[PDB]
Amino acid sequence: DKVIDVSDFGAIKDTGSDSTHSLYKALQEAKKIGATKITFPKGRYDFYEERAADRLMYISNNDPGIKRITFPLSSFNNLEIDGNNSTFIFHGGLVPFILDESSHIVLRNFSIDFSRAFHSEALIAGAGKGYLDLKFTDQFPYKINEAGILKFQSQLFDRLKRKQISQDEYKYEYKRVLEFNFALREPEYMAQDIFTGNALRAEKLNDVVRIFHPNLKAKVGNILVFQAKHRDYPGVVISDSNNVELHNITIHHAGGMGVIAQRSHNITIKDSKVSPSKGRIVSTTADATHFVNCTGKIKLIDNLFESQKNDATNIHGVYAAIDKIIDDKTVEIKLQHPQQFGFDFIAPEDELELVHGASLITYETNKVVTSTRVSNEVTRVQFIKPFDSRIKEGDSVSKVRSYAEVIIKGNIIRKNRARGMLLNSRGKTLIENNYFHTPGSAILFEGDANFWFEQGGVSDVTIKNNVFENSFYSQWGKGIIAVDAGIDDKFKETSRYNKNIVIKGNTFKVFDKAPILNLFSVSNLVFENNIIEKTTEYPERKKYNSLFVINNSDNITISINNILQGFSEGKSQLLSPTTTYK
Amino acid sequence: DKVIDVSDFGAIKDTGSDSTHSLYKALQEAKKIGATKITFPKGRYDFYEERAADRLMYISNNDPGIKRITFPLSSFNNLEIDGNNSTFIFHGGLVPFILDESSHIVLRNFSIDFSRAFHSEALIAGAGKGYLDLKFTDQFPYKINEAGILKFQSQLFDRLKRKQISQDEYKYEYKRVLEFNFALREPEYMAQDIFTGNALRAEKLNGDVVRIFHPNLKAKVGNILVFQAKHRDYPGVVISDSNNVELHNITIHHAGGMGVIAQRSHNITIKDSKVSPSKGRIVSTTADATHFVNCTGKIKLIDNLFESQKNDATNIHGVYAAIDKIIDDKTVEIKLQHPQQFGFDFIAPEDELELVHGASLITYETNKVVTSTRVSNEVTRVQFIKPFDSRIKEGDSVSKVRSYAEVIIKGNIIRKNRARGMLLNSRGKTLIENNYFHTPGSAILFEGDANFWFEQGGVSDVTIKNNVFENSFYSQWGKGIIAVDAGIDDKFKETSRYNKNIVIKGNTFKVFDKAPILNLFSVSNLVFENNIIEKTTEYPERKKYNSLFVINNSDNITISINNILQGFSEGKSQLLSPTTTYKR
Ligand SMILES: OC[C@H]1O[C@H](O[C@@H]2[C@@H](O)[C@H](O)O[C@H](CO)[C@@H]2O)[C@H](O)[C@@H](O)[C@H]1O
Ligand SMILES: OC[C@H]1O[C@H](O[C@@H]2[C@@H](O)[C@H](O)O[C@H](CO)[C@@H]2O)[C@H](O)[C@@H](O)[C@H]1O
Ligand SMILES: [Ca+2]
Ligand SMILES: [Cl-]
Ligand SMILES: [Cl-]
Ligand SMILES: [Cl-]
Ligand SMILES: [Cl-]
Ligand SMILES: [Cl-]
Ligand SMILES: [Cl-]
Ligand SMILES: [Cl-]
């Protein structure tokens, strides 16, 4: 009809049977008659791999390859999916949602989770030099092979069944471990990622598994998280689509990012949450949300982003390195980071910034006349006029876009690994009424043209009426609000990558003298009407003795109109900037 | 015009520079004007990943996914590629050739190799309880991380460069090891695969010697240990949905998987070519030398050398698809079973399908398809013109009735490889003539099953004539020199007749013990005549074998009196009398 009921196509709740193909037929009928809504009777729905559509997908900042997709929303328009607060359980390697060249899509009232997490967790029962003793719950199946290696499994165990289980070992490969505080259910204070690779020596003590690595260190009683090595199955992919809304969507887990958007226009996530399911301390294995080369309005409103293994959000562009200079008008650009391969974005009549790599200073803006994709890495680009004579190979290009207007309000950011928000948004950005409790920098202006190759550089930011409670209590960043753009030291005085930032009306609850602001190459920033409250939530770090570290900047104002409470010193010292951590 | 010189498009020999993009433009020009030949000035040409065309590919019996292709021959026609005996070096994860919906393609006069093999080799310098001491040459770079695990690298080592190299580790993952005899450069006598997984505990002694730890490690000092590549991502030449393809004087030194893999293709010829290791290596391709899946017309392997590969020299078979769901009396959903079979679409309307009982490989009936709908890379819904056999159950399998390929395999040399020689799963007219076999596994194996590999076999017209089987089946990959191992349960061996009409004549069998020359079951009409059987002492005799002919559940089998046996102690009457067991 106008509204389609999935149960009319065979998708039946609370049975544990695969509803993938019944859902697919309901989707095709909705496209056939132009139905405006698809609804689920409230219940549990399970989705498996065997009948899910297969498509080749390049997904920015995630792993490319063949994807089995449960909701293949390719070229859909004016469609709402209302789950009625149903529970969606995905079995194996599945991408729940991919929105590809779709328009006006509303996802509403359901939860996403996987039958077995791609990461793994264990209770730390013992510890010593070069080892940890671990106890695994049943929902993290594993085995120790004859080589003495710990390998997590999709399930415990004929020959063809064993072969299928053997092929699933890739999905649950680890690469590092991170210790989580048991009581606070957050990354352990000042703990760092401990790299291990995908092969840890292990042996069962003769229910306790002992793992061996010379860099292992953790507190007994805490939770050890095995970080998933891959990002193959993000929760919701928004690709080349527009006007997408997520309302009351719970993403309990994903093989990578919860929501990843690329080259998409107008995206809203509201009243949703990324939070672990029962028996887990971690939600998604990568960023909660992420936006690449997106335009229009990006709205994160009244969400809860917690316990994921990476940043809550990152809104940025793509830098493509200048690999080959052919003639004075033609260049061949190359995508650099492996998870950026296959990102096509340079089209004829586009305007490109021609940026110096080590400085992030734009030489000029040139217009593209022709574009030719050679591979998933290299694209040949010819300009309308000869480009700047100073451009060398190793510099980078970036697309001049109608940069996304960022509206991030009412969100809770806590318990996650790494940073809170990477504000690489050059458009008008508003960060209002958010709560931060992150081990890394609550807010970070990053971007570089040497590794990540992410285009950042703000020009209109307002950070107002937020609460920063005991954030940056570890080492993922350089302060509560910090700049860490990829600018060489010899260019910091010359470059001005981030401009026009207002930080007002916020409350900073801090436990030591870590930098509240750590800025370089910033032009025009005002810090006024904020409250700085001293706490004793974590042990004080002797590394830091300055709340405001400022270098190679101009027009920075740490106004007298700021209230400080609980400190022994006064504004004369604590509000005076330094060049070092002091 | 008619002949395009690739150097006219910037492909320069003997420079080490990437010629991928120059070659691509020469290919597009040949298609634009209908050129008939592309020539390479004789020299060395290097191809890299950075500018290779990317396509999704499903390659049967190999690993699917994104492929970077150096020669993307998609919808090319009447084109010859003459390398003039050039050397093509491929750096990293590249598929050298993919022929997709192409016709009348001839490849001749060049060699294919990779700058670093996907497998690894080492000299065994020492041994002890639960370990092996290994010495790796410079062309097999490796790392031992802080976890103490051996991880082979694309090269020895900037932050971005370290990330690129680290991502290459997946390409060189291992899963098992095999011992090779140093002097004879073959799998060690009676040695078997030793499973390890992709993670071996290792430590560098003092450096230069690496000690690997595993309780099942066992090998002779002085021999060579081969680390089997875990993946089959980069086969040498892929022939997919194409027709009339010829390979002449093609040297495939290495591949990430199979040398030549053909699927759903008509008329293929491989002549005067060879699969053999490059300098400093004991192994060539990491999987089958040649392989043909659902192929039709004529398959010709003429005067080739297939040696040192980690699998069979050839396998010519069809695809069994299991009946996963019965919708109604006319409608089923079939499912591809083996992971390296996913994405193999082959059922179309008007196709006729065999409907086969799984455990017996006995065909209930043939039925014609009216409707076909691909659901995933595993499941396809099929509707038939008439209600199918009432005895058909979920778990049985279907197979496409095809104009099964006529197989002509003449003048080849098959030796030094792992596993078997030729898997004769070809139901079409098959001729095996004037070949030389020296395989650790069965020289000729009739296999097929509908429970794991899901490969359709079952011959109907085989002539094995004037071949030389010298000291073959000297290890354990099979059940004899010429053996059947079709997936037929013992319950049904007596009523199932999967292989029919086989003639084995004029051959010379040089054997070192009394392992079975023929090990047959479920065979009807076989004649073994005019053969010469000669006793050797090349390998130690195996006491568990005491019968040259082991025959069970068969009919019309003739081990004729006109065969000749030399060098044995027992009488001719006793040596030609078949048994049901390996001994008595
Ligand atoms: O900074 C850009 C980068 O951030 C996220 O990931 C990295 C992670 O890969 C690394 O190991 O740690 C840092 C924290 O120190 C970040 O978490 C994004 O997932 C990634 O796509 C990229 O955007
Ligand atoms: O038998 C069918 C099968 O044969 C080949 O490989 C297998 C190999 O995977 C296994 O480990 O050992 C056997 C020998 O005992 C064969 O070498 C083909 O590569 C495979 O595609 C399939 O056709
Ligand atoms: Ca064709
Ligand atoms: Cl305010
Ligand atoms: Cl103080
Ligand atoms: Cl600093
Ligand atoms: Cl300092
Ligand atoms: Cl040594
Ligand atoms: Cl015995
Ligand atoms: Cl006699």
Residue numbers in the entry:
A (entry chain B): 25 to 181, 190 to 238, 241 to 616
B (entry chain A): 25 to 181, 190 to 238, 240 to 617
Task: Copy text from the publication.
Here we focus on a GH110 enzyme (PdGH110B) from the carrageenolytic marine bacterium Pseudoalteromonas distincta U2A. A campaign to identify enzymes that could hydrolyze terminal α-1,3–linked N-acetyl d-galactosamine and/or d-galactose from the A and B antigens, respectively, and thereby provide a set of biocatalytic tools to perform this antigen switching revealed a set of enzymes with specific B antigen exo-α-1,3-galactosidase activity. These enzymes were the founding members of GH110 (glycoside hydrolase 110) family, of which all currently characterized members are exo-α-1,3-galactosidases that are able to hydrolyze the B antigen glycan (Galα1–3(Fucα1–2)Gal-R). Overall, the results are consistent with PdGH110B representing the founding member of a GH110 subfamily that exo-hydrolytically processes terminal α-linked galactose residues in λ-carrageenan while providing general insight into the specificity of the family as a whole. The overall fold of PdGH110B is that of a right-handed parallel β-helix of 11 complete turns.
To trap an intact substrate complex of the enzyme, we targeted this residue to generate an inactive D344N mutant, which indeed lacked activity on pNP-α-galactopyranoside. Crystals of the PdGH110B D344N mutant were soaked with an excess of αG2, and the structure was determined to 2.20 Å resolution. The refined structure revealed four monomers of PdGH110B D344N in the asymmetric unit. The monomers were organized as two noncrystallographic dimers with identical arrangements to the crystallographic dimer observed in the PdGH110B d-galactose complex, supporting the concept that the dimer is a stable quaternary structure. The C2–C6 portion of the α-face of the d-galactose unit in the −1 subsite sits on a hydrophobic platform created by Trp-486, interacting through CH–π interactions often employed by CAZymes. The remainder of the −1 subsite is created by an extensive hydrogen bond network comprising interactions between Asn-85, Glu-488, Asn-348, and Glu-480 and the C3-OH, C4-OH, and C6-OH hydroxyl groups. The +1 subsite is formed exclusively by the positively charged side chains of Arg-451, Arg-208, and through a water coordinated by Lys-207. In the αG2 complex with the mutant enzyme, Asn-344, which would be Asp-344 in the WT enzyme, is 3.1 Å from the glycosidic oxygen and appropriately positioned to act as a general acid. The structure of PdGH110B in complex with αG2 shows a small pocket, which we will refer to as a +1′ subsite, with the appropriate size and charge to accommodate a sulfate modification. Notably, the architecture of the −1 subsite leaves no room for a sulfate modification on either C2 or C6 of the galactose residue, indicating that PdGH110B requires an unmodified d-galactose at the nonreducing end of its substrate.
